[PDB]
Symmetry: D2
Subunit: 127 residues, 4 copies
Amino acid sequence: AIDPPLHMLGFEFDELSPTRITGRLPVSPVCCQPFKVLHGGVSALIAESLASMGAHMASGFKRVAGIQLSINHLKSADLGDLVFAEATPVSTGKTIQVWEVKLWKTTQKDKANKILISSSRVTLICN
Amino acid sequence: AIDPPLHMLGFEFDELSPTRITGRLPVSPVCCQPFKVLHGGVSALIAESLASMGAHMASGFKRVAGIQLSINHLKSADLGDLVFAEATPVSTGKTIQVWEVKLWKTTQKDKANKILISSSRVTLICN
Amino acid sequence: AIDPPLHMLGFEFDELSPTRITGRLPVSPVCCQPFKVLHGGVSALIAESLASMGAHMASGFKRVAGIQLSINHLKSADLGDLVFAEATPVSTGKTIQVWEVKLWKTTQKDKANKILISSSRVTLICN
Amino acid sequence: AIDPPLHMLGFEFDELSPTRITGRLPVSPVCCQPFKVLHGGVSALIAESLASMGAHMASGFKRVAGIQLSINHLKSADLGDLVFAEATPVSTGKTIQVWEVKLWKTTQKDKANKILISSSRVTLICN
């Protein structure tokens, strides 16, 4: 509950390191836009949170701010699916960092096969 | 509670029409990344939600899906500020709609003067 | 010919100032992707050039670099159309500037009616 | 001369297949913004062109149109460097394709080591 929005959505962190942040989100009702699919805004919120955590870590816990996000929503995910997120750096300098955040789903019917649903690039200035 | 995650964050919708959607968000602790500023992911979530509501309306209630979001974070907003959001169409065709979403803040000290903090373009596919 | 790509494409500048840069591009064969429509890459090249010129001017002719561009291609333009470009600042601080670049077309048949075909946001760091 | 503005800038295509398009660009004076670095607009123009060629191929030669481009400029390239470009699909469906385009440079001094300078995501609508 230090990212309260992520906590509220039921996101759970797996790995944190300066080169990689992962976690998971069961797609629950609070996560959905009204057709019982995952809200694209929730994918965007995830991308921003994990990229900012990554950047903080990669910068020596100096202050960072997201200044641009670009996200592609590739496929929908349904209520009851499970989403996996992974953030990694595309570029780290002293001033600008760029992170990529990928989201994949698995379903009730098929739980093995991670299907890419979202891909994002987050640009951050590191103070 | 026509967008459940936004409702839980304290967002209130104001105007809905086929050319303009608005509402407001008090910047409360649940909306903040941990330095007591508004979470950039929340700004993204707002852009996606309002653009989607707009498109759904402007399309005559066909199914719409956000496929790309680009957001610029221009300025931060602090805990205790009030955020105002406005979505309007940049382009509406039969298949693709592009909506712009602007976020402004006012503060405790200065409540007259809306200061732009974020601007977003959301690309949606319709029917 | 200080932006040689723009010169090569036949772009012509109209107004330069720290708050507004305009010009025009006849849509000629060199400007087209192979269906005799304006190349989306050419719109993107315009957006980058004008935004960078604007930022240079607005920054006191200090060094600037484009670090992110996001562009929406809203409508096509045909061989023989005329394109108009306008760059203006969305946000100017000391470190980050954000410019918007809009492109409109007029056609042989209809020359009065400027139809918006492209809209872009360019994020620049100003050194 | 399957993309005329790129051809005039000195771009050479290398590989075409439904999952990968490549080519190269010597960074010559015609490709430069005026401080003797590669024009960011040229990097954008490359992304759009190659993603579009890819989509046209991966769709079985249906008509495709770029509707959104997001590009991160990570590092500059100097006059005299050589740029390598590679486009590959992130998502291919029937209606929307998303392609990623990476640009790398090598230099006169160091010709072995490809250094990533740009990364782009291009969203296209097909048929």
